[PDB]
Design a protein around this ligand. Sequence first.
Ligand SMILES: CC(C)CCC[C@@H](C)[C@H]1CC[C@H]2[C@@H]3CC=C4C[C@@H](OC(=O)CCC(=O)O)CC[C@]4(C)[C@H]3CC[C@]12C
Ligand SMILES: CC(C)CCC[C@@H](C)[C@H]1CC[C@H]2[C@@H]3CC=C4C[C@@H](OC(=O)CCC(=O)O)CC[C@]4(C)[C@H]3CC[C@]12C
Ligand SMILES: CC(C)[C@@]12C[C@@H](OC(=O)CO)[C@@](C)(O1)[C@@H]1CC[C@@H](C)[C@H]1[C@@H]2OC(=O)/C=C/c1ccccc1
Ligand SMILES: CC(C)[C@@]12C[C@@H](OC(=O)CO)[C@@](C)(O1)[C@@H]1CC[C@@H](C)[C@H]1[C@@H]2OC(=O)/C=C/c1ccccc1
Ligand SMILES: [Zn+2]
Ligand SMILES: [Zn+2]
Lengths: 662, 662
Amino acid sequence: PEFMAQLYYKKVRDRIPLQIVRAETELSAEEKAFLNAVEKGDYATVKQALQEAEIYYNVNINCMDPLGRSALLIAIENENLEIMELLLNHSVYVGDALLYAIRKEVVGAVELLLSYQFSEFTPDITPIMLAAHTNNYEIIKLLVQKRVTIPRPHQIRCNCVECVSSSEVDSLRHSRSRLNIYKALASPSLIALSSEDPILTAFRLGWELKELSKVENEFKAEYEELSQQCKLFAKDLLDQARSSRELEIILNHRDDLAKLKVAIKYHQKEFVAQPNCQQLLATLWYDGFPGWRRKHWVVKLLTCMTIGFLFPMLSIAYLISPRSNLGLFIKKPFIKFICHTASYLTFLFMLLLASQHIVRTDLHVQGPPPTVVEWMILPWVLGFIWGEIKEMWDGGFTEYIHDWWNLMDFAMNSLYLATISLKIVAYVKYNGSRPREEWEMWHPTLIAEALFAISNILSSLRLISLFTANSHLGPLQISLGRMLLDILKFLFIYCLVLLAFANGLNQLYFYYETRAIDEPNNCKGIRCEKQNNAFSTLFETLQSLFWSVFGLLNLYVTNVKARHEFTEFVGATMFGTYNVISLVVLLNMLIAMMNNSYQLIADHADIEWKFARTKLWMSYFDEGGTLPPPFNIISLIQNQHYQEVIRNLVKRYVAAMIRNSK
Amino acid sequence: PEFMAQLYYKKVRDRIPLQIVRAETELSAEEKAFLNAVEKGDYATVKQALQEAEIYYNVNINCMDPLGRSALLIAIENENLEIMELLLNHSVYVGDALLYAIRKEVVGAVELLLSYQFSEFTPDITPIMLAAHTNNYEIIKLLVQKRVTIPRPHQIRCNCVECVSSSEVDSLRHSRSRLNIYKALASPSLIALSSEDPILTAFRLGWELKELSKVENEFKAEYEELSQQCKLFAKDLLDQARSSRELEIILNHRDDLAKLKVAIKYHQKEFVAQPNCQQLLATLWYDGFPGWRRKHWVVKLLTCMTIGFLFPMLSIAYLISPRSNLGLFIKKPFIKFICHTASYLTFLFMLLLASQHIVRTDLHVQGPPPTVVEWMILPWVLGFIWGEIKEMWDGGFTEYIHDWWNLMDFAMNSLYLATISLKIVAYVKYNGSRPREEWEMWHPTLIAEALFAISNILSSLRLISLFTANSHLGPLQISLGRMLLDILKFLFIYCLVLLAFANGLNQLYFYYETRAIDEPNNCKGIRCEKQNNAFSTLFETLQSLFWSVFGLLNLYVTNVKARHEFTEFVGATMFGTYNVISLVVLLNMLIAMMNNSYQLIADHADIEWKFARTKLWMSYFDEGGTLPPPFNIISLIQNQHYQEVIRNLVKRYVAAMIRNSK
Ligand SMILES: CC(C)CCC[C@@H](C)[C@H]1CC[C@H]2[C@@H]3CC=C4C[C@@H](OC(=O)CCC(=O)O)CC[C@]4(C)[C@H]3CC[C@]12C
Ligand SMILES: CC(C)CCC[C@@H](C)[C@H]1CC[C@H]2[C@@H]3CC=C4C[C@@H](OC(=O)CCC(=O)O)CC[C@]4(C)[C@H]3CC[C@]12C
Ligand SMILES: CC(C)[C@@]12C[C@@H](OC(=O)CO)[C@@](C)(O1)[C@@H]1CC[C@@H](C)[C@H]1[C@@H]2OC(=O)/C=C/c1ccccc1
Ligand SMILES: CC(C)[C@@]12C[C@@H](OC(=O)CO)[C@@](C)(O1)[C@@H]1CC[C@@H](C)[C@H]1[C@@H]2OC(=O)/C=C/c1ccccc1
Ligand SMILES: [Zn+2]
Ligand SMILES: [Zn+2]
């Protein structure tokens, strides 16, 4: 019989003889009696046993069970306060007994041990850290009353001698100690009890823990859980506000919604999207419309279009006399938003009018003067450039870059400046009226028109950022922008496959490159009626494979004039393999990946959209940037009140979490 | 070492010194003894302590624990009735102790406190409101027996001085109080106990709470949960009916299925789809077919086709003598449905015959007389118009608009009237027989034919509303109609992207617009053999991008006669970016969004379909609208019985929920 040998033992028949491999020194019969007495609760028996153990040495006071728990730990686990006290009086080893009492979360034993080998706890654990890991307000309060400390963690990217030495001598212990310290600090009970500003402490700690999660590639999930715990603590403190006065004291605290800007800076999405914060925000947003929420959608539409049609009137009123019954009407955030959206929509309307023929120049004049539509477009372009440079001046490139729409605006304005410069060059370097079919490939007028059309696409696509303000379009934009990332990752794999097959196809077909004269209509490439030279060059092959993704590459492009049937079959099979790999493997990768990411989105989409809409709204609360283009180019008592409100909220939160335990 | 400073404290080294930041005034040692005695249960100790506290002032009767719970609250939490009574006799502060007793849900303590700082409850909470939030029948009954009140909530869109003042002084408190009142009113135990009509109260309250959820944009989920709680209460009351007499007493109550029409009006889908309600409905529906359920599908098919083939016979019998053995056969809802479906199918068959050549006119006569097929079509068209105007007359535009199929019928009838009017105009304004290739672009005959073909599409698509009557097609229609909404939202984003890229492409290519004479077959646009001028105008560009979505736009359209290689590459790259953005980004948005919405559908699809089928069935229970086109154009004891049935159902429901607690 063929047996499975060397399963449990190295020795080289039909049975597995089981013995205790790691045998450990057992206790005496009287020691076992001592531990049985301390487990059972026989106070007199334990008293007699250790009283006689005091006389001689035959009995051990610090006798340790095979499971590692001495008599004191069994007394702790059974909450035998009297046996605990009797053991402590007679000098039982009291190492790490406080930690077991704290983890059991019994206040009496913790008080008793606070008033006077193998461990279940890593050596770095202290009583305050372990109590904070249990989030027990009573025990944490007991330990903080007898003034304790928690070691201060270093910066994430620290290079001091301590850090470089601990992480090189013992990396596992150093990482564990760091995580334990952060678990203690991120404790809602410890923040509530011992933080001067619990809400700011939760903000900063959640931020730093998210950053650690990024940096500490392993142990990422624990740091993410700690960050979420801090965020939920801050949001649950905000949940405890009972009046609008408390909420405005919290949100306006600075150390006009200062604490809310701090929350937006730290990406405290849950805190910001808290319903009372959002209700206060919507009250500030609809300043001129107290009854906006209770209006009918037709009334809303007529009011919005009325304010939009009058944005030049409101802007001119603000310019002429800002402090007037009409000057400061555009100072309202919602009116300001309507006026800015109207200004931008008129800009896009003029962009549309540019390509029409309402007023038009001859298409055969090289370097023409600007059209009156282009003349009217220019003030908006200058206003957008001025607004973006003002934004970067007021925010720094570190905040300018953080916005993707801001980079898109940068590209838009760069293309518009290039269009103006190319139009100037064409105007001052060409005088005649050469027919357009005679113009060179890189004529500045042709390049100016191309750049202007790209600018038009970008400007019109800039409207998707206004979706955030809508209850229905906002979450859609959040989901779309969040799956753009897996689109990018799939784009990486797709471009690698594309480049591989372009290499192969071009290596095959680059011999049969025909000259453009030899083609039917003197047309070379795949943008002809008769597609030809699809894989003759690398750039063309890349275009051909891209367009094959959409079925716009015909099959006859895989055929050569020489009619080399083996080469034409190998090219057709490379093309077919590319079509299989891309169209029905990687595209379905994209579909499945999008479905997964979209489920993960739809879980949190409401909070994400509310945070984005709060950012959008806050962008209109400030005085700077009131006028839309083209018109933009022409203390101690506060801390006392915050501390009282925080006192009340911490009390309410502590009571709430204590009840939620029960 | 770089430390993370200012984590817990503002002060600007390697340790975090933890102190109690919000220190609160502790109690005396004797006060702590008093609270320890009241927690422990030492009746004699507490009695002695407060008896001696009566003499001097050294002890405080109203001593309050750091956790905010005084001695009375600890007695309540431990259900110490005797200590509670002794404390109440000696004048302990009794503020908000009833609320803690109610939340603990102990009847003895509530009775004791009903017979004689920091709070865990918001100040607006009253005993009856809190008891209703706990849904405890015993406690609610105790509090209602001692006559109490709940403040009456205002209308959703209220503008009185009270509302405008409370919401401006304290919006958070006002919103909280409104939600608390609605949480109390939506309590199944309070509705069962104190509502004259529990089922109608649940209907109205669920409706109003859904409307509040709509209006109160924040706190939407709480109002939605309250609405669902009301709906489930009504459905669970209906679940308690044990005989068909009780069910017919409930459903026919009016204050012929009056309560069921009220349930349909309030969108009480769960109540309507309750199996016994549906069984009664199916009994009323198959009036002429008692054994319909137990028949074989072939027998059903033969019977249905027999009744359908005889719809003119049944309609004429109803016309000649409505009160006869054959006149009132079409008065049965299922027979009526079969006859209406047959009438409409014959109408669609004649619409199909219209485009055939069984009988046909010369295609070169402008303004021809109607074909005999069109002559036969006319009575159905008149009947449909008459039926829709009768429906709007009997239902008001407010109910007419609520149906989407009703708007589709409006469009159908408008197009049919336009077709008749255009045919009349062509007949009375053209006499000759001009060849059809000579006709003008806007010839009334051509427009009449176009409108008639659109009407044919709409009429044939109107059959999808009959899917509701089928067990398999009905849920499919429900799912399809529910994902049409995310289709619409994606249509918004898609049209924005479409317009952006159409702007760019037209701005690029509008210079190279060739004249239609210069094209191969004198054909301009993308509906030619040689597609050309794809992006020459804005409307054409919009069509070209739309058709590129389906691959019907060829690539050579991105090429100009002038052979401007940079412009042709920029156009091809705009076209490629549009194809990437739309075809493999937004379409996959649609796929993932549809999958999510379809999961949410499939959860409730059965209830949704049963509600829709009940509406369809109820549309055939009424005498008005018996004849299908073209033939349609030629009390106190009841309340007593309802109250007895409601008494029995409320008793059964109360017992059921009490047991479900255990
Ligand atoms: C999509 C095609 C047909 C091009 C149409 C372009 C514009 C006419 C549309 C596209 C996106 C729309 C915007 C989408 C988002 C909104 C939200 C809308 O209502 C709100 O919810 C904001 C007010 C609030 O926060 O209460 C105000 C208008 C606005 C900017 C819309 C204005 C009209 C816009 C610019
Ligand atoms: C799909 C193509 C081939 C065109 C065929 C058109 C009609 C012949 C079909 C399409 C939808 C069918 C309807 C789909 C729904 C039903 C349910 C069917 O059986 C039922 O469940 C209703 C009776 C009941 O409630 O018990 C009765 C016929 C009817 C109207 C069908 C009649 C035949 C219809 C009109
Ligand atoms: C959109 C634009 C950036 C494109 C579109 C081409 O334009 C043309 O070929 C006409 O000249 C061009 C020049 O630039 C490149 C040639 C090779 C490939 C990288 C193409 C680029 O395409 C993608 O980067 C991504 C494509 C994709 C995404 C998802 C699913 C399937 C495909
Ligand atoms: C269907 C009909 C309403 C269309 C179809 C066009 O007809 C033609 O172009 C021939 O003349 C036309 C005239 O009217 C419009 C031109 C531009 C675009 C809005 C088209 C419309 O199309 C959609 O509204 C939506 C399209 C879509 C939806 C989902 C996924 C992908 C695309
Ligand atoms: Zn064997
Ligand atoms: Zn360091």
